[PDB]
Structure formats: C-alpha cells, structure tokens
Swiss-Prot record:
Heme binds at C348. InterPro entries: Cyt_P450, Cyt_P450_B, Cyt_P450_CS, Cyt_P450_sf. It holds the Pfam family p450. It is found in: Cytoplasm. Its EC number is 1.14.15.1. GO terms for biological process: (+)-camphor catabolic process. Pathway: Terpene metabolism; (R)-camphor degradation. Involved in a camphor oxidation system. Its main location: cytoplasm. This is Camphor 5-monooxygenase.
Length: 405
C-alpha cells in the first residue's frame, strides 16, 4: 500500500521503505534500516509507504534537521500522519521556547539526582532477578529480565501498581509497534483513562512519586494543568515501559553470540562504560520525525509545508561517514558517534537512568552468568517501529558455570 507520489517529489528520490515492516527484517532490525545507506540510495529519500514521507539517511542531515526546529517542528513527530496528529505528549510535541518550562519539570523527575537516589534499588533488583534466574540454566530474557527489570523500577518511581504492567505495556506497544489491533488515538485514549483518576488523586493528596511531582509542578510561574500533567505523564510511561526494555534484548542477543565480547568485559571492567556507548551506537533503536512548518529547500530537495520527514536516530551511528566499519562492535573505538538518545532540544532526559540500568545489567549478569548462549534452534525475531524490539530471546547455560554472589 503505496500512496500516489505528490507532485513536488522527484521520482528519482523514491525509495519505498516501510518503517513498520522493512524488507530485510530477518537479517536483524539495524541491518534492515542500513539498507537506506547503501550507495544506490540518495541522502534524502521519499517512501510511498505509510502515507508518504521523507527519510533523511545520514548522520549529518539527521542532526541538522534535529537542530532546526524552526523548519522541522515536533508538533507531528510520528508517522503515519494520523498518529503524529493524535500525538500530544509534553514536552515532545512542543518546540522551543515553550518546550523549555516543560523539560525542566520532567527533568526534576528523571534527571541525574533521581538516578543517584535510586541507584541501590536498581542494583538490588538486578542482582535479585539474576540470582533467581541463574540456577535455571534457561530463561526467556525478554520476559524474564528485560521486561521486569526496567519496568519494575519505573513503577517504583511512578508509584503505580505492578499489577498494571500487562495493561500498560500493551497500550505502550500499540503506540510504537502498532499491531493493527488499535489506532494511535485509541491507544492514547486508553492510557489517558488510566492516568486521569490518578492525577486527580495526586493533585488532592500528593506523594513523593513522579506523578505527584508532575501533577503539582510549576511551569511558567503558574501551576501545571491536569491536561498538561496527563500529557507529560503519558510520555513518562512510554519512555519507561518501551525503551530500555527493547535495548537490553538487542545487547543480550549480541552478548549471547560473542564470547570474546563477554570476556573483554569480565577481564577489563573499566571498559563497561565504553562498551555501553558502543552497544547504544550499534543497537540504536528509535526512529521518529518532524513536520515541515513551511516550504523549505534542504540539501537541494524542496520540502513542502506539511511534509513529514522521518529522522531515524538509529541511523546516525550506523553511517560509515560517522563510524568506520559501523556494523562491527568495537569496545575500543577512539570515537563512538551516535544520536541514540536524540539530538537538539529534545535530547533524552531519561538518558542517565537508561545508562545506569544498562551498565548494572552488564556488570551483574556477567558476574553470575559469564557463559551463556541462544537456545539451539531458536530463531530470534526482531520487530520494527518508532521503537524497535526483539520478540523473544531464549537463552541457555550450564548452571555449573555460574557463580552465586
Ligand atoms: C535506550 C533507552 C532510551 C532511548 C534510546 C531513548 C530515546 C529517546 C529519543 C531518541 C528521544 C528524542 C525524541 C525526539 O527528538 O522526538 C527521547 C526523548 C525523551 N526520552 Fe528517552 N530514550 C530512552 C529512555 C528513556 C527513559 C528511561 C525515559 C524516562 C521514563 C525517557 C524519557 C524521555 C523524555 C521525557 C524525552 C523527551 C524530552 C524532551 O522532549 O525535552 N527516555 N528519548
Ligand atoms: C521516541 C521516544 C523513544 C521518546 C521517548 C518515548 C518515545 C516513543 C517518544 O514519544 C519520545
């Protein structure tokens, strides 16, 4: 389902990539997207899929477009257009200067200071989950570790019942990796039904949780509105439920397949943080966009007001012009260049929490479970979308090779 070419699009600029179902998915998700960077593909292409939209293919253009909020507005950040249209999350659906007062509040909630406070719980949960798994000699990493670990911390942070997980997780999934089961708006409404009561409750009778803070915060010297609060919280949820979760599976998938990588981290722990940047570069997983506020000529291509453009965060680090041998994982690269956490005014506030959960996982897993692999005859499937993922990740190990801590 290809939409008819708009008149202003030169036919030589056509490259029909489906962000929801790219061709090479079998090869791995990052490999499926990287087809965009082959020598046959222009720098800026038009895909007829998902209603028709631009895609910038190179780290340079992604960064520029990301910097330029004047032309590339955040108002309609998701493709397809109906989804970008229904999208009303704060601070993400706002541009500067308006975005600023909102970002400042979200920061209060997720920023450095919070990570520092929550450090010991993260470590405690990680060790507990791992130890519980260790003697089994087998899990479902995605369900057994990658889901609980990050989500239970977010639930803790947010002061929401662990009971809600399955329901929230479904809705969040709908937004980034749409099933056909529900439309963006529907999904958005459902999450909103969830949140509304809670905010009301935390407006009246505040706690110390992130929802209590967000609901009672000040923005531009006045108190936040319930609607505003609902709209930030919504984003906090999707951020919390849908990101680190998927990241961890790619990383673990790679570690299960690369013994030499595991050992390097065991022997030279000082490398973990370098390894973390390298894995964030290679297993980058986010692709959203922007909308043209006006007619604009960008690197010689005429964009029309209202055109949407995908600016795949994932792609910058995979760009050979930015990283030599991009598909190769090298913990000792002089310069790991990526935009995994975004670029421009919208740079990820949750980045600090994400790095903390990654590095803890790597250190604590390797400690107890040094030697593991993907289960014989398991075919790992990736998924594509606003946030990519791994369907399931069956691992096996000999318990006798494990170490209790
Ligand atoms: C591997 C993990 C993560 C990645 C790859 C990631 C990626 C991103 C990307 C690429 C953006 C920018 C979007 C744009 O410019 O439209 C974004 C923004 C944001 N992320 Fe993260 N994120 C991660 C984890 C999280 C966490 C754990 C949270 C907290 C719950 C979170 C909260 C946010 C927020 C609030 C923003 C928007 C800030 C603003 O618009 O000023 N993210 N993230
Ligand atoms: C692109 C993102 C990864 C970022 C945090 C959650 C997400 C889906 C958005 O709506 C902004």
């Amino acid at each position: 389902n290809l939409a008819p070419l708009p008149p202003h699009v030169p036919e030589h600029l056509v490259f029909d990539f489906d962000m929801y179902n790219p061709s090479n998915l079998s090869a791995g998700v990052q490999e499926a997207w990287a087809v965009l960077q082959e020598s046959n593909v222009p720098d800026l292409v038009w895909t007829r899929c998902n209603g028709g939209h631009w895609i910038a293919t190179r780290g340079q253009l992604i960064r520029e477009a990301y910097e330029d909020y004047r032309h590339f507005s955040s108002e309609c950040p998701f493709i397809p257009r109906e989804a970008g249209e229904a999208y009303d999350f704060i601070p993400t659906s706002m541009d500067p200067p308006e975005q600023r007062q909102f970002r400042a509040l979200a920061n209060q909630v997720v920023g450095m200071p919070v990570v520092d406070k929550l450090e010991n719980r993260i470590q405690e949960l990680a060790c507990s989950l791992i130890e519980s798994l260790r003697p089994q000699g087998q899990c479902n990493f995605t369900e057994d570790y990658a889901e609980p670990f990050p989500i239970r911390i977010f639930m803790l942070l947010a002061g929401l019942p662990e009971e809600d997980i399955p329901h929230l997780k479904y809705l969040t999934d709908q937004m980034t990796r749409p099933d056909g089961s529900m439309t963006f708006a529907e999904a958005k409404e459902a999450l909103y039904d969830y949140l509304i009561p809670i905010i009301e409750q935390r407006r009246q009778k505040p706690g110390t949780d992130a929802i209590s803070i967000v609901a009672n915060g000040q923005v531009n010297g006045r108190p936040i509105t319930s609607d505003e609060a609902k709209r930030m919280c919504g984003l906090l949820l999707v951020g919390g439920l849908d990101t680190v979760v998927n990241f961890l599976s790619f990383s673990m998938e790679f570690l299960a397949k690369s013994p030499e990588h595991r050992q390097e981290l065991i022997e030279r722990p000082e490398r973990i943080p370098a390894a973390c940047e390298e894995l964030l570069r290679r297993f980058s997983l986010v692709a959203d966009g922007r909308i043209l506020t006006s007619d604009y000529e960008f690197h010689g291509v005429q964009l029309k007001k209202g055109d949407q453009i995908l600016l795949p965060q994932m792609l910058s680090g995979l760009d050979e012009r930015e990283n030599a041998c991009p598909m190769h994982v090298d913990f000792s690269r002089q310069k790991v260049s990526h935009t995994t956490f975004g670029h421009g005014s919208h740079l990820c506030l949750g980045q600090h929490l994400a790095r903390r959960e990654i590095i803890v996982t790597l250190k604590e897993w390797l400690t107890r479970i040094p030697d593991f692999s993907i289960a014989p005859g398991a075919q790992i499937q990736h998924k594509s979308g606003i946030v990519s993922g791994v369907q399931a990740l069956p691992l096996v190990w000999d318990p006798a090779t494990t170490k209790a801590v």
